[PDB]
Design a protein around this ligand. Structure first.
Ligand SMILES: CCC(CC)(c1ccc(OCC(=O)NO)c(C)c1)c1ccc(OC[C@H](O)C(C)(C)C)c(C)c1
Ligand SMILES: CCC(CC)(c1ccc(OCC(=O)NO)c(C)c1)c1ccc(OC[C@H](O)C(C)(C)C)c(C)c1
Lengths: 238, 10, 238, 10
């Protein structure tokens, strides 16, 4: 069975997530309305900007994160933001229509919508595939949340100074998840492996997203549609 | 500069 | 009577204005919706950002502007943007309710609304007074447009290199307006003077706006609500 | 930098 500290960590993450993930999606009405050159950029820019703020809120609650140097926290957020965001979005992803449903039909996104935000199938194909394979793992809230904490605490990111203290925090988390799957998840003898593999898929997606983003960020007619926070987090001006 | 990120991380 | 070149200038400005000033205000639905700490900042930031793009469109059509150095064009836009914007807004200002009406009730702004965007009466009092006195001059479209071209072509702005070529372009404009008032505007024996005085009021407003803006721009929780274009035009990173 | 302003002024 799980230890108290192991369980306290799970309770902390699940609560940090609930506190940073709004199931009513009542904030999407405050974004620049979606329009279906790059007509979806304004809306999706606000979505991502809003999601970054949520990921930051979450990160600050991951046990051990608050004690790192501001520099490492930055290095970790900047390098994993988009992957965490892709992980968070799976909650609203549907295996039927292969889309994201966030309240109303206005906020129902298809692969076509991201295309109108400057992205190509070069990225979207692997993205939907990742969403589908992830959705199929039918993760418990506790595993989904651990995966996001595991992801955010990867020491193998550029700019990370103390990759020993972070290597540790992630190890601690990785075993919590490993223990949880073995104790609380029936038919999950080979789930952990599949999950770690999902983290590897994220890297590829991250690489591809950054490429296409860089392309977009160098065109001022498009960069001007971005928000300050997005430009700072996806920027290279580190 | 990351000034926005620093403020949010406080 | 007016000369052909004098009239061609008037026709060019009136057409540049019509091409950059949308009377249907059908673009306000694309802004982050208004919300009545600094709840109006998002919406009013998008309004101003959109207005800057219109002022730039207009400027590029002012005869003589396109031939200046990119540097002077920048120096002129950055220093006069807010004044031109205050001048443009008068078109939707009403002497009855003392507000700005841009289509629907959602887009009806009161002094209270700007307060929710980080501004104080220190600025808003003089602003409404300027709007009222301006509205009372009952300018013809030709005079209102000349005033905006006159304003934008003020050589006495910081960063202006060739204030001789610009001093000239503005002189040319100032006499066009002076001639128009004398020939086409009955009961306007003392209008020109009142107009030039209105340009002086704008300077005070500009000074005050920049002060309060600087205050806001140094607070990242607020600066992040601004748009790239606003930050660049009201920024000091010249 | 004024890169956005330059692009719009073109
Ligand atoms: C519309 C689909 C998606 C999938 C991950 C998304 C993100 C966050 C979401 O919300 C979940 C959540 O918890 N948020 O708080 C939801 C439901 C969906 C996305 C959005 C924008 C994108 O591209 C963005 C562009 O790259 C920019 C240049 C940055 C604008 C890409 C490539 C994908
Ligand atoms: C809501 C009233 C107003 C008055 C000049 C305005 C600007 C442009 C407008 O449209 C006319 C037009 O032609 N546009 O295309 C309309 C109808 C009104 C304003 C708006 C924002 C403000 O403050 C803005 C803040 O200072 C920021 C920090 C920059 C967000 C201030 C001090 C005033």
């Amino acid at each position: 069975m799980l230890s108290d500290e192991q369980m306290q960590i799970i309770n902390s993450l699940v609560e940090a997530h609930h506190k940073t993930y709004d199931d009513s999606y009542s904030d999407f009405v405050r974004f620049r309305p979606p329009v279906r050159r790059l007509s979806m950029l304004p809306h999706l820019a606000d979505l991502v900007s809003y999601s970054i703020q949520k990921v930051i809120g979450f990160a600050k609650m991951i046990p051990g994160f608050r004690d790192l140097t501001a520099e490492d926290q930055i290095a970790l957020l900047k390098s994993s933001a988009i992957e965490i965001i892709m992980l968070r979005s799976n909650q609203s992803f549907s295996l039927e229509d292969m889309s994201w449903s966030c309240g109303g039909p206005d906020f129902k996104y298809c692969i076509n919508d991201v295309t109108k935000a400057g992205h190509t199938l070069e990225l979207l194909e692997p993205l939907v595939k990742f969403q589908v394979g992830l959705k199929k793992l039918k993760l418990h809230e506790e595993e989904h949340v651990l995966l996001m904490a595991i992801c955010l605490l990867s020491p193998d990111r550029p700019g990370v100074q103390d990759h020993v203290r972070i290597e540790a925090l992630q190890d601690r988390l990785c075993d919590v998840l490993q223990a949880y799957i073995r104790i609380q998840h029936p038919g999950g003898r080979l789930l952990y492996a599949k999950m770690i593999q999902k983290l590897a898929d994220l890297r590829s997606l991250n690489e591809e997203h950054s490429k296409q983003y860089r392309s977009l960020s160098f065109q001022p007619e498009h960069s001007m549609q971005l928000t300050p926070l997005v430009l700072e987090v996806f920027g290279s001006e580190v | 500069k990351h000034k926005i990120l620093h403020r949010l991380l406080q």
